[PDB]
Amino acid sequence: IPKEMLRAQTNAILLNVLKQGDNYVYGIIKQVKEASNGEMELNEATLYTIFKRLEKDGIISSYWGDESQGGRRKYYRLTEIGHENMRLAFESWSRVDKIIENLEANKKSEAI
Amino acid sequence: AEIPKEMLRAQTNAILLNVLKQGDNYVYGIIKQVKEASNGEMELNEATLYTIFKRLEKDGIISSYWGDGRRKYYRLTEIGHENMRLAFESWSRVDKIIENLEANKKSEAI
Ligand SMILES: [Au+]
């Protein structure tokens, strides 16, 4: 599995987890660990790197939590731009499957 | 907000490797079939293929040979086919992870 594809996957995951609600990193890693039957330990480093991009792009935003409790954790939130990105990713990928669909279709066409 | 470069590259590659999957081919031909399969809309630029093919050839995902004008055919390699398989399986496991996230969310909501 190429690293490019791994980080693309981690991205798909994070946008999705934040879709279901604002979260923090230790929490995000834990929920995916659970939702993948132990199998998927996300890499803190890759998360951090991704959040800098996604914060850059305004796909996510962040705020401080747990300050009332003596803490200072960082909560992330999917933005509207966030939801738009995910929509266009979906639509975009669906368009690609259709192009491939049509390639396979036209192949079987010439075979006739 | 727009679709980032990395996703664009990934998409273009998805398509090219898939054209190769369906049968070894030459570049004029590849671009023509995609033009057809995208209802006229997507006539790739040669240069984009060449850029991409250099990477893929580098990584051993594709290779090339002469056919008899004597065109240059590119072929998905075995490693090629393997990678596409594992990519598919891997991405399917990711849909399940997401599936399961949405499932656990609706669970706690109750
Ligand atoms: Au595939």
Numbering used by the authors:
A (entry chain B): 4 to 115
B (entry chain A): 2 to 69, 74 to 115
The publication says:
We present a new class of ArMs featuring a genetically encoded noble‐metal‐binding site based on a non‐canonical thiophenol‐based amino acid, 4‐mercaptophenylalanine (pSHF), incorporated in the transcriptional regulator LmrR through stop codon suppression. Next, we investigated the incorporation of pSHF into Lactococcal multidrug resistance regulator (LmrR), which has been demonstrated to be a highly versatile protein scaffold for artificial enzyme design. We selected position V15 for incorporation, since this places pSHF inside the hydrophobic pocket at the dimer interface. Here, we report a new class of artificial metalloenzymes featuring a genetically encoded thiophenol for binding noble metals and the application of this design approach by the creation of an artificial gold enzyme that shows efficient catalysis of abiological hydroamination reactions.
